[PDB]
Every structure is written in structure tokens, then in C-alpha cells.
Ligand binder design. Sequence first.
Ligand code: HEM
Ligand code: HEM
Ligand code: HEM
Ligand code: HEM
Ligand SMILES: *Cc1cc(OC)ccc1OCc1cccc(CO)n1
Ligand SMILES: *Cc1cc(OC)ccc1OCc1cccc(CO)n1
Lengths: 146, 146, 141, 141
Amino acid sequence: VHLTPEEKSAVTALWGKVNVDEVGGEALGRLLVVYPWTQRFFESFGDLSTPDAVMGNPKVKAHGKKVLGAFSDGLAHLDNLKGTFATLSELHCDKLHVDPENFRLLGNVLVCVLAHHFGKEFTPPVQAAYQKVVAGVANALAHKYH
Amino acid sequence: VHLTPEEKSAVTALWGKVNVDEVGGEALGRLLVVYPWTQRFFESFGDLSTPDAVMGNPKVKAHGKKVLGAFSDGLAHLDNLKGTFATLSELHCDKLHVDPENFRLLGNVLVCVLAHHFGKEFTPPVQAAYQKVVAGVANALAHKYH
Amino acid sequence: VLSPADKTNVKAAWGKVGAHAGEYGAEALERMFLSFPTTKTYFPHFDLSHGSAQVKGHGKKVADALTNAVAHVDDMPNALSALSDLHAHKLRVDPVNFKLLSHCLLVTLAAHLPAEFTPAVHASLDKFLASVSTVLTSKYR
Amino acid sequence: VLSPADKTNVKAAWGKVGAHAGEYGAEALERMFLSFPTTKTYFPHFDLSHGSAQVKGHGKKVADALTNAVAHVDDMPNALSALSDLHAHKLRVDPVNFKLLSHCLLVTLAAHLPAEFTPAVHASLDKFLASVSTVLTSKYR
Ligand code: HEM
Ligand code: HEM
Ligand code: HEM
Ligand code: HEM
Ligand SMILES: *Cc1cc(OC)ccc1OCc1cccc(CO)n1
Ligand SMILES: *Cc1cc(OC)ccc1OCc1cccc(CO)n1
């Protein structure tokens, strides 16, 4: 992914303020609530019967944190996303068989969450920069398919 | 690089009976009729105002023939679809900006056309083999997006 | 959203299916299971072997449902409410799977009724199945 | 298909926009044009520069159309027929572009109305926009 130095700075500035304890879980949680069929991949996560149940679920928050961490690693290796996510891609594609469109969905849900947390600070330019990142991460995750 | 020895034999055998001058035009014509927004990429082709107009358009039939020729090139190099369509990928992605979902739709329309022509001969196993071919062609064309 | 011509085309084509609905339903399922193996995971306890009596029975279930949807093309949400509860609420079927079965239904139709499978009818049947899929994958209760 | 709950969620949330319609509509467009450059190809005659007065005005038309859609949530095909003629018959907009704008509208709502953008409301707003998108991209006349 190609981010202008101005975009890199903006992205990094915002990411450094992200609440690593909640953002990931809210992103994964919203994914499960907005696109309920994605719940089928988290059978063992316990109660996902209602929105509040999903969002407050300890396993959802913990797993969302790992998801967030994968994005943080992606930001730290924008020049090599395919290698960085090789392991994760084998897992999500060869084992879980997650449809690529869902990767895109989560990437955008994350964008919505960042917008939710930062409000006006999440300007159109900052979003555009993040859209390049999530698209890049999403692509890398589905590369084991190609 | 996907695709079993038996699936390759099935694809090759059926393809030897395909009418190269008709199938492509029928597939492209149906793409334009079933998914009307695709007509936007063929503004210079003339009258596309009705199903009969589309299916009777000489330019649509002529172009479908080139499209089918490319599919044939792919079937002759099943283990290297990425290379076979590299140039076409640049054109459709970088130049024309055709959303990849459309590549998948054309592939499935082609499958419908094969089913239509072959009838009972287009058995579930033959279809399964062809689904692998069109999915591979679609991914190869979207390569410039990866 | 279906046009008046779409409704006309769907009713005529499905009518032509007639008493073969069950047979075509089973073939479409078999085509889906074989072409897109991941779809089998939605049926963990089914006998999905070729020619399976269970699949034959399910094909008839699916076909009859479509016949019902065709009869209520102007009132599908209400007509398919129970089927939505099942696919959307309980099974939570990923919508991509409905596109797969919808495609196999079209392939099955094209393979059996060539004279009826015109570009216009093809287009109409696709919109209809996409509409049905939307209703079954949405939780509207 | 929207549930009674989705309808009330959308009305309450979108109702908060109010006099911010043009502002939010314009912002949603700016976000789409900047994040997904390919969308600009549908507005070749437009001045798409940031702050553009043309984009601001168009943002208002889009916002107002949504407000109208919310008001006619039970008969959108009828209420949105003019817009469908425009986007599906004349412009032949690829449906993927509607997903992009819908995403940007959600982003805009989340950035301005954090209290309104709950998980359930987010789900309803998404279904609502997908519904409007389907109508605007279908040729049903
Ligand atoms: C595109 C962004 C995504 C990222 C960055 C991501 C990241 C991760 C990470 C870091 C793990 C943990 C792997 C490990 O500990 O070995 C994981 C596991 C998993 N992911 Fe994803 N994921 C993404 C999308 C998805 C989607 C869309 C689904 C499906 C709806 C999904 C389903 C799963 C499942 C089922 C697991 C296994 C959890 C368990 O049972 O332990 N992921 N993901
Ligand atoms: C997925 C299979 C597809 C194959 C194998 C294919 C193949 C071709 C070929 C062989 C050409 C000729 C290139 C040249 O010599 O300049 C071409 C051109 C083109 N294709 Fe495709 N194509 C595919 C899908 C699509 C789709 C889905 C669209 C858009 C909906 C599309 C739109 C076009 C356009 C606009 C041109 C240029 C036509 C012109 O000369 O005006 N193609 N394609
Ligand atoms: C044209 C769309 C579809 C129609 C009309 C349809 C119709 C039906 C009908 C009539 C039943 C029987 C309900 C009952 O037992 O009372 C059923 C069950 C079921 N359907 Fe579908 N269906 C569709 C697509 C799908 C898809 C795409 C999947 C997943 C790949 C799916 C998965 C299931 C499953 C798992 C069951 C329950 C099987 C069991 O008894 O365990 N359906 N469907
Ligand atoms: C569901 C979301 C959308 C809504 C509610 C919407 C609404 C509208 C409205 C109200 C107009 C003005 C019609 C008039 O009064 O003449 C319009 C025009 C237009 N829309 Fe959309 N639109 C949507 C999505 C899109 C998308 C996704 C694209 C393409 C990326 C698009 C491209 C256009 C274009 C090119 C025009 C014509 C502008 C002009 O030449 O004046 N719209 N839209
Ligand atoms: C008309 C239509 C077209 C597509 O894509 C081709 C998807 C869905 C759809 O409509 C589903 C539908 C049918 C009847 C009632 C409602 C909502 O009240 N949605
Ligand atoms: C309800 C609904 C959900 C989705 O999500 C994929 C897409 C479209 C859709 O409904 C469109 C709609 C709305 C109102 C009336 C009709 C047909 O009369 N279709």
C-alpha cells in the first residue's frame, strides 16, 4: 500500500490514540451484529444472542483485541502485508474458509468504529488513508485464495 | 495451479465441442441483459436498449468472440491463468476499472450458456470443473487489484 | 424490485417447470454441493451422497417454497416469513451461499428448458431469486 | 427487508440529522470521492474539488432524497421511482458504488452522532441503505 508521508503521519497520529482495549472488540462486535451470519464462525464464543450480549461478551472483546493487534502489525509493515499476513491467510482461507467479502466488511466496520471514537478528528482525508490500509490488509488476508 | 487431473480432462473434452463463434457473443450479450449496469462499459457498441437489440448487436457478437478466445487461451494453460491474463488484468483493472465482482458474474453467465447449449451433457461434475475454471479466470483478471 | 414483465416471465417459466420442480430442486442442490463443497457444512447431518433420498426430499422442499414465492411475488416477506426465521435467525446463512444456489437453479433450468431460458427470462429469474434470497437472509421480525 | 424495529431506528437516527442534511450529505460525498476515486467517473461534468459548491448542493439533494425515503419506508419503489429511472436506467451505476456511498454515509453518521450510532442502529441503517440501493439500481418499470 502506498501512503503519502502526510497520510502516514496522519494515520499514525490517530492510531497512537486508539483504545487498544475496546476498539477491536467493538469492531468485531459490530461485525457480528450488522452481518449476523459471521457469528457462525464464533460458535464457541458463548452468548451472541443479542446486540448487548455480543458487544459485552468477554471473548468477543479479547478476540477483537487480537484483530486490532493484527492491524497494528499491518501498519508497521505496509511494505510487506502479504508476508506479514501469510500465516493468518492460511488460517482464514485454507482452514476457516471465510469468504473474502467478509474481510472487506470487517475492514470497513473498523473504519466506522474509528469514526465513532474520534468524531470530527476522523476527517475525509484521514479516512481515505485508512481505506487504503484496510483494503491492503483485506487483500493480504485473502491472498492464499489467489 | 488448482484443478485436478480429472477436472482438466472434463473441461478439455467439453470445450472441444464448444462453438467458438457463438458462445462468447451469447455470454457477453446475456451479461449486458442480466446485469444492465455493465452496458455502461460498452457505450460505443450502439443499440443496447433491449434484450433483442443486445443479442443482435454485431459488435457485441464480435467482441464476445474475442472474449471467448481469451477463455480458450486460459483453458490451454490451466496451471498459469495468472500469466495468461496478465495483460487483460491491466486493461480491465488499471484502465477500465471494472469492479471484480463483474468478472465473477461473466464467468457464471458463461456457465449458464454452457448449460443452455449442452443440456443434460452439462452434468454436475462437468459444471463443478468449469466453476473452477471461471473462478480462476476471474481471479487472474482481478490480479492487478491484489 | 421486480418489473411487471419480470413477474410475468417468472410465472411463465416456473409454470413450465410444472411437475419437475422437485427433480430440478434436487439437481440444483447436488450441483451446489459438488461445485461449492463449503455449502455442505450447512447440512452436517445430511446424507449428501449422490442420488440421496434425503437430498431428493430437500429439493422438493426448496422447489415447493419457490412455487409459493412465485404465487406471492407481491407479498413475499409475509409469505416467506417462516423461511426467513430459519435461514436468517437460526442458520444465519451467509448471503454468498444464496448466490451459489441461485446460480445452480439457473444452470438447472437452462439445462432442462432451453427454449424457455431466453436472455429476458434469464434476467427476470435472476432478479427473482436475488429477491427471494434477500427475504430469506434478512431478519425482519 | 426492514423490520418494524429497523424502521423506527432509522427514523430516530436520521431524524437527528435535521438542518445538517446538506452538511452530512456533502461530507458523505466528499468521503466517497476521496476514499474511492473511481466513483468520480460518474461525475465528469462536476467540479469535484474540495469545498466545491456543486458538491455541497448535490449533497443536499442526496440528503433530502434519503429523508424522503425514510418517510416512505413502506413504499420506496413507488416513492423512489424517479431516482431509479436516473441511477438504473440512465446512469447505469454499478451497484458496488452504492455500497461505497452507503459505507461513507454510515461513517459520516458515526462521526457526528455517536450517541445515535449504536450497534443495533448501525445494523438498521446499513439495511436501510442497502434497501434504497437496491431500488435505485433495479429497473422495475
Ligand atoms: C480482515 C480482517 C481480519 C483480521 C485482521 C483478523 C485477524 C485475526 C487474528 C489475529 C486471529 C487470531 C489468530 C491466532 O491467534 O492464531 C483471528 C482468528 C480468527 N478469525 Fe479473523 N481476522 C479478520 C477477519 C475475519 C473474518 C471476516 C472472520 C469471519 C467472519 C474471521 C474469523 C476468525 C476465526 C473463526 C478465528 C478463530 C478464533 C478462535 O476460535 O480461536 N476473521 N483473526
Ligand atoms: C472475466 C472474463 C473476461 C474476459 C476473459 C475478458 C476478455 C476481454 C478481451 C479479450 C478483450 C479485448 C482486449 C483488447 O484487445 O483490447 C476485452 C476488452 C474489454 N472488456 Fe473484457 N473480459 C472479461 C470480463 C469483462 C467484464 C466483466 C467487463 C465489464 C463489465 C469487461 C469489459 C471490457 C471492455 C469495456 C473492453 C474494451 C472493449 C472495447 O474495445 O471497447 N470485460 N475483454
Ligand atoms: C432459493 C433459496 C432457498 C430456498 C427457497 C430454501 C428453502 C428451504 C426450505 C423449504 C427448507 C425446509 C424448511 C423446513 O424444514 O420446514 C430449507 C431448509 C434449509 N435450508 Fe434452505 N433454501 C434456500 C437456500 C439455502 C441456502 C443457500 C442454504 C445454505 C447453503 C440453505 C440451507 C438450509 C438448511 C441448512 C436447511 C435446514 C436443513 C435441516 O433440516 O437440517 N438454504 N430451505
Ligand atoms: C442511495 C444513495 C443515493 C441516493 C439517495 C442518491 C440520490 C440522488 C439525487 C437526489 C440526485 C439528484 C436527482 C435530481 O434531482 O435531478 C442524484 C443524482 C446523481 N447521482 Fe445519486 N444517489 C445515490 C447514489 C449514487 C451513486 C452510488 C452514484 C455513483 C457513484 C450516484 C451518481 C449520481 C449522478 C451521476 C447523479 C447526476 C448528477 C447530475 O448530473 O446532476 N448516485 N442522486
Ligand atoms: C427486487 C430485488 C432485487 C435484488 O437484486 C437483484 C435484491 C433484492 C430485491 O428485493 C427483495 C424484496 C422483495 C420484496 C419486498 C422487500 C422488502 O419489503 N424486498
Ligand atoms: C430489505 C432489503 C435488504 C437488502 O440487503 C441485501 C437489500 C434490499 C432490500 O430491499 C429492497 C426493497 C425495498 C422495498 C421494496 C422492495 C420491493 O417491493 N425492495
